[PDB]
Amino acid sequence: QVQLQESGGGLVQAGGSLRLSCAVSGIRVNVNAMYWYRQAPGKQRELVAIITTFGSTNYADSAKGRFTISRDNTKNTVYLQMDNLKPEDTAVYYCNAPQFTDRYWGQGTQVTVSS
Template identity: 25%
Template sequence: MARPWLHLCICLQIPGFYAALLLNQTPGHILSQTSNKTEIPCELKTEQAGLYWYRWSQQRQHFEFLLFSSTMGRATYGPNVRQDKFSVHEARSQSSYSLHISHLHPSDSGIYYCSMPQSSQLLLGRGTQLTVVDALPPKTTQTPVSKKPLPRTTKRKAASREGPCSPLVWIPLAAGVLLLLLSLVPIAYRLHRLRRRLWLRIHGQ
């Protein structure tokens, strides 16, 4: 099996929306306590021979290959990765997998990515940030909201701020369109280079 971490620099160039079509990784953040265990789910939207798992450690500034789990239930671990700590379990749907982490320690904190091969490259999920703390913060009780009706003037002001032209609506929409256009630039550049190579081959002969 080829070392998958050598291709990470390539997969980072793939637009994120394309990976999201094939991988669904939720939730985005998990908070757990030391010595406990947790699981990080990842849903595949296409048939694959297996799934890779990586971890980015902000503290050590290190991207680490954890393991590769095949659909046959076999696992190949990265160097210095404890097999009794990490394991992958398949859900009943046979398209959802979860990375189980036991004996949690603050050093396990980081962003965990599930990954799959696609066209000789690796696609990364959106990542799940795991934060391991010695003590969980106390649960705060929410103050009940008063059901007293608002004055008519207040209602009109709130309605005007939440209208279809509100900045809360069009600013995220414009940002999403801009990110989509920026993600298409690498694809257009590659197609241009491929087209130029084909033209040179044809006219070179």
């Protein structure tokens, strides 16, 4: 199976920073493009950031230069650095590969941002 273990969330003040981790098993992150998503309560899942196999990145407009996706190939782990957080970023954050979004989701990591 593919395993997705999201971590690094918590309660953070506005203007604060987080670094999310997703430890992956069953696929290689240096072979596969990897995506981060978020889901606020009662809203649709939103794509946040992507990193391609060869390391190109793109971000949703809501990220607007605050988020940085990266990976560690040895730890087979994907990271999302999130700076200058705002209350509107409160959501559960999920990591996935595009080929499995119809198939499996991890538990996500809760991020709550308060003023």
